[PDB]
Write a protein that binds this ligand. Structure first.
Ligand code: NI
Ligand code: NI
Ligand code: NI
Ligand code: NI
Length: 571
């Protein structure tokens, strides 16, 4: 059957290049690659193209190096980058599946796609931006952005440019060139009032280092067509290095290591984080809220329709890494996150956003790699559901969970597909969490065709707490309680999970009517992991789940279950 849904991701094109992605089927056992054709002429194979353009790809190939016996699910590439094109030119494209036996599928339905016109180019050095070792460049960089006409590319060339909060606008690209480091100011005054997370949030957070934030309005379409690209680094200047400041990773490359702090330690551990918490406490906040709310995140983009993030390295946030709040049509392509172990330094947060795509990312994060959020309590639905996410061809290294939905489930997290990824040293593959009074939940979540090694904690955890007016809770409680259902875990392999907690852990509170339902687990092999602990679950089935080298006596531990089934036989 022909590959489906060949497409250019939102804004993933410029004057000389176009990125293509397509769906891979559920069952890829026979598919070993994809070949891409332009006007029926072979441009190449997806595997080879990713070797060239994806920062995840060498890590992903390397993951299989010691996999004699073919234990690990072999992921396929679902993207191809076309370069060397001409400005304002249409190109037609098809894709074919390449099979084990060497034959090819029928072509996909073609697409035509057109490169853009060569953009006005604005260099920040022409506004007096300077890498001189302590000029603050905020004004220079903001002047360059302000001078932008629609379609402008703003360039930060090689060099380290210290900067305070910057404010982006519609219809522009900020390009961070090779050798460019955008460095956060450590001065809290360089980050003025930014935003409140939700409309009903009461504490104002500072601006991030990079912002698309309208002072009054969060609605999707407040901004449009924002692109941040290039192979340079955005460094938030949040934290000191850890005692072991740098490590050599599994490819022999160096990773930075950021101190893992807490609210009572930030005065010794923080840089911007320290200074911002100090300023907030002296302004009157207790230390807990100052730590929790008053550190600048690296990037906050709110109300943007069409966002393309590509190529850049993220380091050292004072708080979160990349935040998307109420955006539509977001693509993150080939970002490199090196933020281990900055406290709350998650890779990408998606908050009440729709139609989001992450591919070719490398994640080494201080918190969750990819987190989904949708508000809290009765007011949550003041906002869009968190709906439509497609996460593929990424390499997850360290982090609190590769795919996390969310704790904040109020308006619903839904229609999430994470396929053809590799995880190595990550805490957890799939994490789903909520409490009763948050409301909403998550549904239609598929985690499939992923391979995992040396997980630090557990494979998959779905947890639902009660309570009640037992609550020290800031939002109004939800009338309909939080639930999870319609979760699919298929064609997944894990070798080693070094935590002492349950490999597959599903937990609720059936007494208080809190259960999960409609969990479908098919064709999963778990080697050298602990037994499962599955609670509060109904109308679910586990088929062709094989445990080998079990760290315990029996894999299956069930309690408080209704209409569930292994494979194929009632529990
Ligand atoms: Ni090859
Ligand atoms: Ni640094
Ligand atoms: Ni961490
Ligand atoms: Ni956490």
């Amino acid at each position: 059957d022909a590959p489906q849904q060949l497409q250019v991701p939102t804004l993933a094109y410029d004057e000389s290049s176009i990125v293509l992605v397509w769906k891979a089927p559920e069952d890829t056992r026979k598919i070993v690659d994809y070949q891409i054709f332009s006007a029926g002429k072979l441009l190449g194979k997806a595997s080879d193209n990713n070797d060239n353009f994806s920062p995840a790809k060498p890590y992903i190939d390397h993951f299989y190096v010691n996999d004699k016996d073919n234990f690990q699910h072999k992921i396929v590439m679902q993207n191809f980058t076309v370069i060397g094109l001409k400005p304002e030119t249409s190109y037609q494209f098809t894709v074919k599946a390449q099979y084990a036996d060497g034959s090819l599928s029928v072509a996909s339905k073609p697409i035509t796609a057109k490169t853009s016109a060569k953009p006005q180019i604005v260099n920040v050095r022409d506004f007096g931006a300077i890498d001189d070792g302590k000029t603050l460049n905020t004004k220079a960089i903001q002047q360059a952005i302000d001078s932008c006409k629609p379609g402008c590319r703003v360039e930060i060339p090689a060099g380290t440019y210290k900067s305070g909060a910057l404010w982006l606008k519609s219809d522009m690209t900020l390009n961070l060139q090779a050798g460019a480091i955008l460095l956060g100011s450590e001065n809290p005054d360089d980050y003025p009032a930014g935003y409140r997370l939700y409309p009903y949030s009461t504490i104002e957070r500072p601006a991030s280092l990079i912002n698309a934030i309208d002072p009054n309005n969060s609605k999707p379409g407040t901004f449009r067509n924002i692109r941040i690209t290039g192979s340079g680094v955005i460094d938030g200047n949040g934290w000191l290095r850890a005692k072991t400041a740098e490590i050599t990773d599994e490819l022999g490359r160096s990773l930075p290591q950021y101190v893992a702090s807490k609210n009572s330690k930030v005065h010794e551990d923080g840089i911007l984080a320290k200074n911002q918490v100090e300023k907030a406490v002296s302004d009157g906040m207790d230390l807990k809220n100052a730590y929790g709310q008053r550190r600048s995140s690296l990037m906050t983009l709110r109300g943007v329709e069409n966002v393309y993030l590509a190529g850049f390295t993220v380091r050292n946030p004072a708080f979160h890494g990349i935040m998307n709040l109420e955006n539509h049509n977001v693509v993150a392509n080939g970002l490199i996150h090196q933020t281990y172990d900055a406290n709350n330094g998650d890779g990408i947060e998606f908050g009440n956003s729709q139609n989001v795509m992450v591919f070719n990312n490398f994640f080494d994060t201080g918190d969750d790699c990819i987190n989904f959020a949708a508000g809290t309590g009765e007011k949550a639905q003041e906002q869009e559901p968190m709906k439509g996410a497609w996460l593929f061809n990424n390499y997850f290294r360290m982090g609190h969970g590769a795919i996390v939905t969310g704790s904040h489930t109020g308006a619903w997290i839904e229609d999430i597909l994470a396929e053809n990824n590799v995880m190595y040293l990550t805490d957890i593959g799939l994490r789903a969490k909520s409490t009763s009074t948050i409301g909403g939940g998550a549904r239609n979540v598929t985690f499939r065709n992923n391979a995992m090694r040396d997980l630090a904690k557990q494979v998959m955890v779905m947890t639902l707490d009660y309570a009640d007016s037992n609550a020290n809770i800031d939002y109004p409680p939800a009338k309909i309680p939080a639930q999870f259902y319609d979760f699919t875990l298929k064609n997944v392999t894990v070798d080693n999970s070094t935590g002492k907690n349950p490999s597959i852990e599903i937990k609720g509170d059936t007494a208080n009517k809190a259960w999960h339902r409609l969990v479908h687990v098919n064709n999963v092999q778990l080697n050298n992991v602990t037994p499962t602990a599955i609670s509060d679950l109904r109308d679910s089935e586990f088929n062709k789940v094989t445990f080998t080298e079990l760290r315990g006596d029996t894999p299956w531990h069930f309690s408080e279950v209704k209409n569930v089934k292994v494979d194929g036989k009632p529990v």
